[PDB]
């Protein structure tokens, strides 16, 4: 057993300087510091995973306090390896600076 | 526009805020800088303002109008019965300034000093230091004290004693003793602690701290005068008698 | 203090650029920043290259400044710079760098097992050498 996902950070939303598009999140992936290296991560699943007070059903398990918002990488952002991600719901601003799991599927290798 | 005629400002902004002292006993903000070549000695003392008189003496000031002549000089009498050393406190120099390192206390402490540790002596069971004192009386505890002294010799840079006053010899209503840290200047740190350790529970007369014709500094709290207006507090000019709404003001 | 000099015939390793990883020879110096280089035996056309993308090696071929590619190749083959290069630790470290990069998942597993066993053997011997050194101290 061991980790099966890459470590990312929720850097912020899509934006100009004074307008914010919350439907797109900018993700920073550990070890990906150029745009030509982001190609592996396009289309891969992304998960904002967190905990709440109330229990919720777990697929393949019993209810617990873990919750997840799923998404996926949609395209690269910039020159230094940032990617754009989209989630089933806009990410909460409290998630900025926190871990975003990037899964190794859908596999293309 | 510019003020018509120049005049210096009233009062010093260097003594601000003109508030009530948080302490009743004068605090030594700076002790004399330590010179490891002098013998171990104390640098401060506690006394009580008794009152003022005047004396007669013959001045010796060549080139003066009062050379070989008698003058009347006012003097202050400060009653300074011997203090009792009750503890040692060590300090370590850190990049954030001095930090208290280790405090040791003598085995015995008089009730005058213990009164300092209480807000209501009447209602208290006088339990202060009743468990600390047992450390000097057993072999295990004694072996820890000398380890504390050895630690203070390794690391501390400043040594101070904890001396208190003897209020049972003064004529004052107060029986609670005034307890202050006095810095031990002089030789090496080890010599400071040897000197201090021999003097736990001992008395120190003022004559062992000061000498005749010595220039000293007196630190204390001034006489309180309560709520005062600007005329008295800051010595501003009184406004003319015709002023409406008061003249003991700043216009 | 300086041991490697930009001069006619100096062989320079190309660290980045379209010709990264190749050896070229300084044929001529254009200005402070650029040189005319040639790679007749290393698949580089004669061209200008900045000194920024160059790392001087310890080989210095002997041909006249701005001699044509025929004589640069001739000097390259006589000095056997290709085989001499591969014998240097510098070349070997490059080879090790690429061997590790291409390691497969199975290769990484086998290295972990070999490394696991090799490190245990060394540690046990070091323990014994430390204990032996202790007895001399006593």
């Amino acid at each position: 057993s061991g980790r099966l996902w890459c470590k990312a950070i929720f850097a912020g939303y899509k934006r100009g300087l004074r307008n914010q598009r919350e439907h797109t999140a900018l993700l920073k992936i550990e070890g990906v510091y150029a745009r030509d290296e982001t190609e592996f991560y396009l289309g891969k699943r992304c998960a904002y995973v967190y905990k709440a007070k109330n229990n919720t059903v777990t697929p393949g398990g019993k209810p617990n306090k873990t919750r997840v918002i799923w998404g996926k990488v949609t395209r690269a952002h910039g020159n230094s390896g940032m990617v754009r991600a989209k989630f089933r719901s806009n990410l909460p601003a409290k998630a900025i600076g926190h871990r975003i799991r990037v899964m190794l599927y859908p596999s293309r290798i | 526009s510019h003020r018509k005629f120049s005049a210096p400002r009233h009062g010093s902004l260097g003594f601000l805020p003109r508030k009530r002292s948080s302490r009743h006993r004068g605090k030594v903000k700076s002790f004399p800088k330590d010179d490891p070549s002098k013998p171990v000695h104390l640098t401060a003392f506690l006394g009580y303002k008794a009152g003022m008189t005047h004396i007669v003496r013959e001045v010796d000031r060549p080139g003066s109008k009062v050379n070989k002549k008698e003058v009347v000089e006012a003097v202050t009498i400060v009653e300074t019965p011997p203090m009792v050393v009750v503890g040692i406190v060590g300090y370590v120099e850190t990049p954030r300034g001095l930090r208290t390192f280790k405090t040791v206390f003598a085995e015995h402490i008089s009730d005058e000093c213990k009164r300092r540790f209480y807000k209501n002596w009447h209602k208290s069971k006088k339990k202060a230091f009743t468990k600390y004192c047992k450390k000097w009386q057993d072999d295990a505890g004694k072996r820890q004290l000398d380890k504390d002294f050895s630690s203070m010799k390794k690391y501390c840079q400043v040594i101070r004693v904890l001396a208190h006053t003897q209020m049972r010899l003064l004529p004052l209503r107060q029986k609670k003793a005034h307890l202050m840290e006095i810095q031990v200047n002089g030789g090496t740190v080890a010599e400071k602690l040897d000197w201090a350790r021999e003097r736990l529970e001992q008395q120190v007369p003022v004559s062992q701290v000061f000498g005749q014709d010595e220039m000293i500094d007196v630190i204390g709290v001034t006489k309180g005068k309560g709520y005062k207006g600007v005329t008295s507090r800051w010595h501003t000019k009184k406004l003319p008698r015709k002023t409406h709404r008061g003249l003991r003001k700043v216009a | 203090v300086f041991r490697r000099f930009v001069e006619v015939g100096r062989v320079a390793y190309v660290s980045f650029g379209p010709h990264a990883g190749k050896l070229v020879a300084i044929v001529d110096v254009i200005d402070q920043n650029r040189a005319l280089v040639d790679g007749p035996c290393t698949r580089v056309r004669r061209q200008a290259m900045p000194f920024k993308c160059m790392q001087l090696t310890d080989f210095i071929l002997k041909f006249p400044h701005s001699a044509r590619q025929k004589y640069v190749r001739k000097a390259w083959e006589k000095a056997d710079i290709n085989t001499k290069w591969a014998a240097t630790r510098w070349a070997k470290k490059i080879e090790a760098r690429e061997r590790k990069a291409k390691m497969t998942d199975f290769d990484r597993y086998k290295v972990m097992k070999a490394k696991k066993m090799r490190n245990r053997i060394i540690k046990n011997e070091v323990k014994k050498l430390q204990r032996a050194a202790l007895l001399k101290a006593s």
Partner: protein
């Protein structure tokens, strides 16, 4: 004209439009250095108009084509005669460069004129470009490279991969 990218050398040939007075007007040729051929023709009409009673409306371009460097693998010294407008006058300069192509040397002239004199490309007229022998060069910056046994080190090599890694344990070494 913007001196964008590396300039190319164009051979532009033009003439006045034939008329009953002169059915075969004389042909004129210019050396033009420009980013593209569209700019090259534009500058031609700007220059001939300053020398002849001609302009795009009363003339035509007969041939526009790039002149290729003839010895792109040989180092040469280029003398350049140019005139330019400063903030407070016009001046004639002679300048020298070392390069493999004549259009590369002319590009260096535009960057250099911009660096040392804050002269925008629209205020520079390259009058003449010649290849000059080492013995005829005048500028000591160019002549110091006329040494058959030239050698020199590369002192204080600055780390240019300053963000790969962005954080490291060892400090960089500048001596090689």
């Amino acid at each position: 004209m913007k001196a964008s990218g590396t300039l190319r050398e164009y051979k532009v040939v033009g003439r006045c439009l034939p008329t009953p007075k002169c059915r075969t007007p004389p042909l004129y040729r210019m050396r033009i250095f420009a980013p593209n051929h569209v700019v090259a023709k534009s500058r031609f009409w700007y220059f001939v108009s300053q020398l002849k009673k001609m302009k795009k409306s009363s003339g035509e371009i007969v041939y526009c084509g790039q002149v290729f460097e003839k010895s792109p693998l040989r180092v040469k010294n280029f003398g350049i005669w140019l005139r330019y407008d400063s903030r407070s006058g016009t001046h004639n300069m002679y300048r020298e460069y070392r390069d493999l192509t004549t259009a590369g040397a002319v590009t260096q002239c535009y960057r250099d004129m911009g660096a040392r004199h804050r002269a925008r490309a629209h205020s520079i007229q390259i009058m003449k470009v010649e290849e000059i022998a080492a013995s005829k060069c005048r500028r000591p910056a160019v002549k110091q490279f006329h040494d058959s046994k030239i050698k020199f080190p590369l002192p204080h090599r600055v780390l240019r991969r300053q963000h790969k890694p962005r954080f490291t344990t060892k400090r960089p070494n500048t001596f090689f």
